[PDB]
């Protein structure tokens with residue numbers, strides 16, 4: 001028993017991290033097969049940051065200007081191209097450690113592991129959620145750009161995120177592996193509105209089920225609610241409206257615990273209206289929304 | 305910027321995980337050089353659990369009874385011995401993926417990453433603290449025994465923990481890699497008192513410094529305290545007494561932020577006496593104690 005904010009084992013991704021240097025800038029790249037993917041802002045100087053013309057900046061660069069290093073060995077760049085906000089550096093050697101992989105676009109509310117890297121070297125791994133407003137709250141210092149987000153299913157790594165930006169508010173923004181930003185963000189040093197965020201209701205309910213499974217049950221009550229009534233409370237507390245699709249996704253947890261989804265909603269309604277009263281659930285004093293229903297089932301079943 | 309509960313990259317440890325089966329029991333082993341380490345309770349049947357005589361149980365076992373599998377390949381066991389609560393299975397092949405490593409005994413209050421495994425296969429990685437009462441609050445289902453705790457310094461893995469037990473209270477207990485339990489625990493299925501736990505004061509202060517560094521400053525006040533006065537409050541709130549050694553360890557964070565350690569203690573005193581008032585610090589509604597001062601400096605400096 002016990003329930004932790006667990007990241008995927010990072011070994012398969014560690015073997016793909018390389019350092020990319022262009023001019024004075026150094027950040028991380030992801031080496032899969034004979035291609036290295038990295039944020040296109042590696043070609044920017046400090047005078048370019050405010051409003052870079054990436055097309056013009058990239059025209060001044062040649063293959064030999066992109067220094068790609070995997071550990072202590074240099075990779076030979078034989079092509080370069082920009083796809084949206086990412087650069088794809090074709091190299092003459094396929095990464096011998098390329099795992100089975102996919103590039104996927106995750107939905108807001110879904111979770112993934114980030115392998116924080118600096119100079120192509122991994123520093124740590126943590127689990128987070130793609131917020132409903134398409135930002136992430138990560139841990140990214142200078143040099144961490146190009147660090148990637150991923151999920152693992154058996155032996156296949158689905159890369160979903162590449163780190164590009166820290167907004168002036170301190171929240172993080174990035175792209176899928178085809179270089180498309182999640183959210184309205186642009187790779188420019190400008191003030192950018194992230195937009196209203198909400199709490200991921202279905203994940204809070206999943207985590208309440210994980211709490212019951214792991215012995216924390218004080219919040220269970222004698223009440224029930226309806227989707228309509230629950231959603232009036234969700235509206236007041238800036239929670240995503242719960243849909244039947246969310247109820248269906250919570251089905252396996254409801255079956256395992258014997259607690260109807262709407263009964264768990266009634267517990268969540270009471271916690272929203274009355275707070276925790278100084279108590280904790282799974283070591284947290286707030287309602288946790290970074291565990292999907294799949295994350296709860298996976299951790300409660302020991303999937304490897 | 306940003307601050308997350310970050311685990312070490314787990315790749316070096318993933319390459320050491322193997323499955324150990326003895327009779328009907330399956331758990332994890334750690335393969336380093338030509339030795340596989342695992343909990344000695346792998347030799348127990350359900351009738352042995354309550355009070356096993358490990359010496360007698362092990363005498364009934366031969367090398368060929370310990371099935372050690374690394375992925376799909378079987379390892380040949382050429383010796384076995386029990387050291388405290390661990391078994392050391394000598395195999396005929398050195399693990400080609402053995403990283404540089406050390407076996408260390410961590411102190412209570414220190415942190416480490418756990419690579420949760422089942423059937424020798426990694427499922428996830430998370431960071432936790434060795435509680436002052438020598439328990440850990442992990443995520444360990446049946447089959448997770450033999451999963452290890454570790455820290456990484458550059459390319460050297462210091463293994464500090466091996467998982468052995470879940471007490472009837474749901475907290476976890478285990479050993480160093482020489483098989484010595486942390487705390488008073490024994491590898492028997494009996495009710496075992498864990499003893500009074502405390503909050504790791506120096507880690508809470510470190511995390512308050514991480515909060516200031518990362519922009520969360522609402523808890524800073526116009527007050528100061530002394531070690532004596534702070535410790536009277538720490539006593540009341542079940543916090544470890546703060547010593548000059550703890551103040552010295554917080555020195556670099558105090559220097560970086562310009563906030564004297566005793567001034568940060570005064571903020572901590574006010575938070576203990578008055579609570580959070582519905583506010584959060586680094587996304588937490590409680591005072592976090594699972595980041596050491598070294599963890600804060602490491603994450604704030606991007607050490608790889």
Ligand SMILES: *CC(=O)c1cc(C)n(NC(=O)c2n[nH]c(=O)c3ccccc23)c1C
Nearest residue numbers: 024025026027044045046142143144145164
């Ligand atoms: C996230 C990350 O690693 C990141 C963000 C930004 C803006 N950069 N680039 C720089 O910091 C940077 N870019 N171009 C230059 O010419 C620089 C000169 C000096 C220092 C930093 C520079 C990165 C890497």
Ligand SMILES: *CC(=O)c1cc(C)n(NC(=O)c2n[nH]c(=O)c3ccccc23)c1C
Nearest residue numbers: 328329330331348349350446447448449468
């Ligand atoms: C932590 C862990 O992986 C763990 C804890 C305990 C007690 N075990 N062993 C068993 O569950 C177990 N041990 N011996 C047997 O003869 C068993 C028979 C059936 C099911 C489980 C058994 C492990 C592995």
